[PDB]
């Protein structure tokens, strides 16, 4: 998934 | 005498048309062709064939619910030998016993969509008019005169025709290539895509104009991408990032755009749960590729390096993510200044927020690279995904806790390989071109932590983010200002004060001191015998994606031990020392004891005991006898210890 950098 | 023609049937020539228009997968049953390019229809007459000297044939096409000639959504044109380049025309290319083969061309800027084709045949003093059939007209990357023209066959194959590809995920260091079925020519998908256009809010506002504007790949790109995650309830997908996808389907499950599109259609054009950036992008690619606009999915990577306020702010939907995906589409830009043709960024991820019906794009990739952020559409939003400027003031210093815009990636043409396109978005770091672009993108600002008076153990006091704006421009910023205890060896303890401001307005040529109150009751229990508090501020300007960090450690000082010298300083005899201390806390002090010593003044260490607790603000004194002996300087030394206030030291020089 997409996570904060 | 001559009687009117009777059409037996019209042959849509699906096989030759499909092949020649690169629309074969779409022409199994219905006719789909691309603009600016001849296609064929073969008329079969019952009885007598067409005779040009007797018969006058005229064709009419309409598209949309309110066609008009001025809008380009209605056209009337005769069957004749003279062919006007760039117009709707029909001419004879073969004539046999009962058959008449015609070649029709559409303008290379005709509106795309479903057209109804009608024919009027007139023989002498009589005429008859009727519906021949329908065709769907698409953008034509093979036609030199079409706005979407691509001069390279291998790229037309990749970016229009290829139905599977790769979407890059993972991280900058560990890139994942997830295969994906775009499926743009699967059964039903083109119809779904035309439906998407006909439920877009601009069509509801003015359908005649909307269908007319479908001449433009700028217009259709904007609507097409914009509709995938649309603030209105008729968009294709709903976003979600909280690992809680039980209502529906996980973003990580999908292996294609087709099932989503079909779901969407079947549920009254209601958003499908759930998307994430690469799912929106993937569906946008399907839609736009279907309609004929060369399109490719791109992934940008961002990287952290780890106590940072910046990474806290984000950790705990314009975030900066581990990766982010959008699409690029190929087209000319006659609506902009010269030289912006080519790849245009379109970002279908949720928040349409600043202004306009849609976000974000299309914006030329070159405008992003060049920092030309006034260029339509939504250039700051795409600039911000591949740029972030972060500066520390510990006291001016570049902070690389966050690096945005790495390893920008897309599938290679005709190959299962990754192409790095970072260079298309960003000049090399430190180059004159980079710095000149950075200048154009922001057209003096500074921050530091101020206090303004003494800081005492036991007191409540304000700290300030002192922000200076020495520029001619207004700024709207988010501010995070907080304080945490810290050990002498740099260990951050619990928070002892926080202030968040969504909307800090900084006026041109101005300054502000934004206060945060540091309460004794908040730092008392959690503070080290180092007495240290780290104050940290983060000023965010989300539009250009610029970040200012300020940090300052503060020392909460102990109460002074007053040490007074009763008697003379002559090189001889008796002497009394008065030592005192005011309780600085708002609470009483228990187990107070002075220890005192100092060779040359006393020979016994004197320890006094104070059973009566020292109230808040109460001072305590003790007097003790010294006896000097020799010429010069002696230093009396004092320790004061307590339950709440240990190892406070003092000294006094005497004689």
Residue numbers in the entry:
A (entry chain X): 2 to 6
B (entry chain A): 1 to 306, 309 to 318, 328 to 406, 414 to 461, 472 to 683
Paper's wording?
Human transglutaminase 2 (TG2), a member of a large family of enzymes that catalyze protein crosslinking, plays an important role in the extracellular matrix biology of many tissues and is implicated in the gluten-induced pathogenesis of celiac sprue. The catalytic mechanism, related to that of cysteine proteases, involves an active site thiol that reacts with a glutamine side chain of a protein or peptide substrate to form a thioester intermediate from which the acyl group is transferred to an amine substrate. In the absence of a suitable amine, water can act as an alternative nucleophile, leading to deamidation of the glutamine residue to glutamate. Its catalytic activity requires millimolar Ca2+ concentrations and is inhibited by guanine nucleotides. Human TG2 consists of four domains: an N-terminal β-sandwich (which, in contrast to previously solved TG2 structures, is fully resolved here) that binds to fibronectin; the catalytic domain containing a Cys-His-Asp catalytic triad; and two C-terminal β-barrels belonging to the fibronectin Type III CATH superfamily.
